[PDB]
Amino acid sequence: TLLAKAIANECQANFISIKGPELLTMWFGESEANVREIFDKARQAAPCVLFFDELDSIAKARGGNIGDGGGAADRVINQILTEMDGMSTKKNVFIIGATNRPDIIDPAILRPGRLDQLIYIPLPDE
């Protein structure tokens, strides 16, 4: 989160942080249309860096790694994917995702036009 904030600060770009509790609230309440509002806010604040901290919360909520009988697809992540695909002309908004469980993350998240650039944040050195 601090790294994303620092990258936003260097470019003097607004920073919007969507924590895991917000995604889980949209999932439990079955109100995933608010993701569209989030992206609209990002558009209004462009240039902006839309950061989705701990994006794997919904996958954990459905069972963690074993999960439910279904696949990796979920309502909130699906809305995020739709918005990200449509969020290509803006250019200003930059989407940064953070996840402590990359294994359970939806593979569609990593397809081109999505969060392609995976960066490993390892434990700090001396």
Partner: protein
């Protein structure tokens, strides 16, 4: 790109087999030709295929196959990094 030693050996063996079959078939036909049409003067032209050529190797490589899949190589890479020398001592320096 990723052929194992066994795969390369199989390719070489198949090329040699193709060359041997072609040589046998050719000299067999050539022997019919003398039996069918006895030539007045005997003049053997030696072997029609004395050594393995490019076409034999191309036909053999046509059947080349990768015995070792990339998933089992991935498991071996996992075990190799399962003998990982830690991740905090790489910069160990004595106090001086």
């Amino acid at each position: 790109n990723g052929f194992s030693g066994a795969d390369l050996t199989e390719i070489c063996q198949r090329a040699c087999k193709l060359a041997i079959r072609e040589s046998i078939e050719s000299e067999i036909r050539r022997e019919r030709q003398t039996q069918t049409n006895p030539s007045a003067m005997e003049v053997e032209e030696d072997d029609p295929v004395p050594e393995i050529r490019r076409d034999h190797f191309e036909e053999a490589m046509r059947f080349a196959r990768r015995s070792v899949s990339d998933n089992d190589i991935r498991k071996y890479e996992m075990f190799a990094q399962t003998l990982q020398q830690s991740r905090g001592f790489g910069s160990f320096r004595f106090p001086s």
